[PDB]
Symmetry: C2
Subunit: 225 residues, 2 copies
């Protein structure tokens, strides 16, 4: 049927589980929606400038920067808590059922994350959904972050797959744009606080679902059309 | 003496002048600090994937996306207002004095912006500070945004200048990182809600000021130390 390549943080695992840390440190859970795009921004800046550091180190550095920007106090224990929550986000309840149906439909399932290879147990293992996937790939071998082309290309090469066989699944349009620019298909799942970007000559996702169930429905239905 | 290459939006011109629009549309002026990094994120995503649209178009599209993320209504009026405000930000009071001091100390002054060329009068002309600068450069001919190396390289090329003669000045650490990776110096001015990113292996700015006056102190001091 094809190979479905899933983004992990926010797409499969619930980023809003971090909200209490932001509520406490900043007095405002909404700062999550400042910090996260700043993290992605700086990951792309390092990539563009020829620098690489593991994603989690950037996450901590950006948390400290955002703290400083809000004049909010941060301790070594706050950073520890950030690590704890970021590496242990629970799976949305729509995930295990959707992955089950995609497997039943004959799709091969893979993950691809900006996060560095993790000591066991990984975030996916802690969430109890790691075993759905035949491979768990990361940006390690590319030393560059999404949406750099090397990331998708090295993934395709690793899987022995052509672009036409692959579909990148994410709640981040930057990730689907990245994959589609390399000739993959893109499937967008509309997690809270994520919507597509409508901009001329920027590719729109091939599939859109309001949640993982609906996206899976569309992926499965497109097999019979 | 050297050439000082200034970022424009937020660095020289006051981005908080947009706050009332965010207050009206979102009920919360602080959404400025979610939209702006999303805008920079998407500018770098387009650059990484080989796509280009003018910065203002991205700004509008990201405004619409952030609005949708907040379930906030957006009208054509709001979009025209964003355009008007983004092209009419006033100069901070500290700018003209700092530029006068730097010019009188013998520095050559240039601007470099992600923003596309405008018809006259430019935002810098309207703000009354365009005359300090010998050149006004943009990423538009490069069709790539900061911090892509092409931006800084094509700038040095246009000026007929060597990297050792150039210093990038910005309140955005992504911009200084971009320039320093090309062997320019970097000068950071700490505009409200901007602070440096402390990350191993990523160069710190050569010069740091809490305002343009303090940064100019440091630049001027470096001439005879």
């Amino acid at each position: 049927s094809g190979i479905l390549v899933f983004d992990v943080n926010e797409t499969l695992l619930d980023l809003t589980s971090l909200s209490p840390l932001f509520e406490r440190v900043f007095g405002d859970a909404k700062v999550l929606r400042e910090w996260f795009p700043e993290l992605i921004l700086y990951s792309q800046t390092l990539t563009l400038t020829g620098l690489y550091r593991p994603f989690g180190e950037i996450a901590a550095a950006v948390f400290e920067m955002v703290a400083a920007n809000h004049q909010a106090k941060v301790t070594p224990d706050d950073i520890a808590e950030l690590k704890t929550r970021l590496t242990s986000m629970p799976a949305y309840p729509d995930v295990a059922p959707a992955l089950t149906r995609l497997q039943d439909a004959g799709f091969r399932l893979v993950t691809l994350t900006n996060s560095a290879p993790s000591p066991a147990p990984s975030p996916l293992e802690k969430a109890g959904i790691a075993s759905f996937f035949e491979a768990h790939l990361t940006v390690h071998s590319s030393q560059r972050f999404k949406p750099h082309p090397s990331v998708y290309d090295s993934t395709a090469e690793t899987l022995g797959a052509k672009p036409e066989e692959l579909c990148m699944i994410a709640c981040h349009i930057w990730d689907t744009i990245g994959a589609q620019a390399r000739g993959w298909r893109g499937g967008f799942v509309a997690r809270p606080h994520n919507t597509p970007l409508t901009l001329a000559e920027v590719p729109q996702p091939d599939f859109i679902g309001r949640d993982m169930g609906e996206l899976a429905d569309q992926l499965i239905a497109s097999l019979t059309a």
